[model samples]
Target: PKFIAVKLIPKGPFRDIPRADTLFGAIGNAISAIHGQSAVEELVDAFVGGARISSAFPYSGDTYYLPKPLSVEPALEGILTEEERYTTAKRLRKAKYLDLKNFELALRLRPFTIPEEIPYARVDVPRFWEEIRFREKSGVYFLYSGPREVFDGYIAPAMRFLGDLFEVEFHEMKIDAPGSEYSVTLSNALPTKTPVLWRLLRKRMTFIAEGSIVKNDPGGMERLELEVYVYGLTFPLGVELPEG
Candidate 1:
C-alpha cells in the first residue's frame, strides 16, 4: 500500500523497572523538562489510547507489513521476488526509525506553559531542595505565601513524589521585603545526578542556580508573588540528545 500523511493534534510501556539510562526514562525526562509534572501523565494516556501494532512498528513502509501476520508465509508463490521483499523490508524499517525521529521533533516543538504564580508555602520548592540536602548547607533559602492549602494539596506532594533519574538542590535564605513578606537567597544547586558513567570514569559534574527577584501586583490574600534564583543547575529548556 502507498503511504499517506495526515495532520493532527500531536500528542511508553516497559515491563521491567526502567533504569535512568533506558529510553523510558530518557523520553520522560525530556518531556517533563518542558511540561513539568503532567508530562508522564500525558504520555501514559497517549500510549494507552494509541496502542496498536503500528505503534510498535513505527515506520511508514512497515505500516502495512509489520506487526507481521500471525499466519505463516505461503511456500509456493508469493507476490514479490526475493529482491523486492528485501528492498521493501529495508525501506519499511527505515521508515519506522524516521517516524521515531519525527515524533521526537514534534515533542520539541510543542508548546508548554510555565507557572506564573507558584503556590505559596507549598512543599514543592522546599521539599525538592530538601531531598537533595539544599537546606542543610549555608547558601540556601526559601520563600512562600498563599493559602495554606496550596502547599498541603498541590506543591508538597509533587516534590515529594519526584522520580529517581536526576538530582537537584538549592540553597536559600529568607528576608522581609515590601510588596512581599517572604524572600530567599539560593546558591550551589545541582540538576541531574552526576551521570553514573561519569563516576565510574572518575569524573565529576556540577551545576549552579543563579537566582534573582521581581515584583508583581503580587499578593495579599490567597495570591502569591515568589522569586527564586540559582547560581547553578538551570533546568534545561531544550533537550540534549544522547551520544551514539
Candidate 2:
C-alpha cells in the first residue's frame, strides 16, 4: 500500500482579534486570496470532503463555517447630498478593490509545498484525528516534521501569534514521529474562545490535516507545513513531498 507522510510543527495558541468582524471584513479579499492558492484551496477541499471518508481519512468531528458580515448603510436615506452618496459609494467600491489587492498579497504567501496523490480516483489520504494537548495558561500545540527547521522558523511562531490573540500562549515540545514505537507528544495545551484565531487555524487544519490532492509536488520544493484547529485548538499538521 502506498503511504503518505505528514509532518506537523508545534504551532502556538493564537491571539484574539478584538475586531474580528471588522478585521475579517477589511481583509476579506486578502483572506480569500491567501486561501485561494491552488495548493491551499486544494487541500482545504480535500479535508472538508475527506472528513466523511473512512479510516483512510477520518475527521475530528469539526465543521468550518464562514462568518457573515454586518451590512453597512448611509444614514441619510430620504435627504442626501449627491456628493455624500457618491463619496460613500466610492469608498465601498474602493474597499473591495483594496481587498482584492490585499488578497493578492496574501495569496502570494509561500509555504513549504503542497504535495498530493490521487491514483485511480482513490484519494489516499484517509483523514485521521490527532488528539493534541492544551493548556489554559500556556497553550496547546504540537510539532511533526522530519526536520526541526519547519518547527522553529514557520509553524510554531505562526500558531503562537494565532493563539496569543485570544490571550493564550503556546508551548511546543519535540516528540517522536507518529506511529513510532514510542509515542511522541506533539504539542502542549491549546486554548478556546479565540474565534478569529480558530478561523485561521481551522483553515490551516482543513487544508493541512484533512486535505488531499492530485500530487502537485513542485520541483525544488522540499516541504509544505501548515496549522489548523477546531474551536481555537490546533492539531499541528503538514505535508512533505519529494521534489521532482
Candidate 3:
C-alpha cells in the first residue's frame, strides 16, 4: 500500500498531540466545509471499505518515531541476565517514543539501545500548559493509505484548514516495514473489541495508544460528532513475534 507522510510543522504551541481520531475529525469536518454532508458519507464509506491511517507521531531532522510498545518490558526476558534485563527494562519504561530503526529492533526482539532523546516532548507552553512542542527541524507526521483523490482533494485541504496551529504538508514516502501475522499498532486506536496484545488509556473510553500489538485489523470507530463521526481505528503493521 502507498503511504503519504502528512508532516505537521507547528506554528505555535498547542494542547494535545495529534491523534488518529482527532485527525479524522478534522478531515471529516473539512470535508463538510469543502464538499458537504454527502461527501462526508463517501468518506466514511471509503474507510469502511479499507482505507486507513495512523496516529500522528514525532519526527526530527532525519528520524521519525513510533510509540514504545507496552510489551517491550516482558520481551526482555530469557535474553538478558536479571541485572541486564532490569536495567534495560527500566530504560525502555522511561522512553515514550522510539526511532523507527530502534523500534524495529525492539519489535523484532533484538538487542537495542535508546539513543539520545526524542526531539519532541510535552511541556507547559506559558499559558498553554500540557501542549506538545518540538525542537527546530522536528515536529509530527502521520501515515495515510487511501485513494489519491481522497487525499489530494479532501484530506490535504482539510489539514490546511486546520492550520493555524500547524503548517501541514503531504508527501509520498519510501518507508515499508512489512507485517507479520502479529503486528504492532501505529494509531492511537479505538478497537472495535479486544486486540491480540493490548493496553488501555483510561482517557478515551479505552482507546488504545499506538504501539500495542494485535492480530486482526482494528478497522476503526465512528464516534459520531452527532454531526460527524470521529474515526479512531487501529492501523496495524506486521511484526515477527515469538511463539506462544
Candidate 4:
C-alpha cells in the first residue's frame, strides 16, 4: 500500500488559552503595542478567518507533491456595548482563549496523510508533510487583505518561530498596497515542507489599527498585511525504489 496524501484545511484545532507565546498571545501583543488593552476584545472579534501558505515538496525521482489550498473561518464573534467592550476586556480575553484551545485540540487529531506514497518505515512526524502536499493539489487558495504594518509588526515575530521549526527561508512578495503583506519561500524543495507550509498558509489575518484616520494618508487606518506561500519541489529519501 502506498501513502495516501491527506490535506488539512485551515481547520486545525487551536488552543483557546492565551499563552505568552502563541498566535493568540501574538495578537494580544499586537493589540497592546498600538491601542492599549481597551481595544483587545473588539479587535479579536474582527479577526474571523484562518491563515494560508504556499509551499512545495518532492518525492521519488520525478514526482513532486504539494499541499492543497485550504480555507476555513475562525470561530470568533460577539456583539458588545461600548461599556462591555471596555471594563470587561479581561473576561472577554479569557473566553476567547477558551475558543482557541478547542480549535487547537481538533487540529491535532485531524490527520492529513499522503495518499499515494506508502511509508517505507513506521511513519511518525513526517506524515504531516504527506497530508499537506495532498491538499495543495486540491486547488485551494486564500484571499488575504488587511493592515500594511502587519507584515513588519505582527508577522515578523511569528515568522521567527515558523522559520525555526520548518528549516525554510522566508521570502517577501512584492505588492503595491494600502496594506502590507509578505510570504516565506523554501530555500530548497523537500517532501517534508508540505504540512508545515500549509500550517502557515491557513492562519487568520487581521489589521492593527482601524478608524484612526491620518490626514491624507493613502494607507488608511490599517497598519499592515502579512502572508506566506509554500511552493513544492522534489527530493528522494525513503521512498519506493524502481524495480531493478
Per candidate, the number of residue pairs that clash is 21, 44, 4, 68
- Assess every candidate by TM-score: 0.19, 0.20, 0.88, 0.22
Give the per-residue Cα lDDT of candidate 2 at 213: 13
Residue-wise C-alpha lDDT for candidate 2, range 1-244, written one tens digit per residue:
0111121122432222112122212222332444344433433333232211111111111211111110111212322337866765544333311121222221222111111211112122336422323222222111232334433433334334443323322223231112211110112112222211111223222211111111222101012344321221122222222222
Backbone clashes in model 3, listed as residue pairs: 179-238, 180-238, 180-239, 220-233
Q: Highest lDDT, which number?
A: 3
Better of 3 and 4 by TM-score: 3
Q: Per-residue error at 2 for model 4, in Å?
A: 33
- Model 4 misplacement above 4 A: 1-122, 125-145, 162-164, 172-244
Error of 1 at 99 (Å): 16
* Model 4 lDDT tens row, 22-58: 3334545655665666555444433322221222222
How well does model 1 score by local distance difference test?
Answer: 0.24
RMSD of each: 25.0, 22.6, 2.4, 21.7
TM-score of 3: 0.88
* lDDT (Cα atoms) of all candidates against the true structure: 0.24, 0.23, 0.74, 0.26
Q: What is candidate 2's CA lDDT for residue 17? A: 15
Candidates in descending lDDT order = 3, 4, 1, 2
Model 3, span 67-119: residue lDDT tens: 77655656666346467667777877788788777777776677767867777
Q: Write the per-residue lDDT of candidate 1 for residues 171-236, one digit (tens) a residue.
A: 221221122221111112233333211111111323221121111111011112441111121111
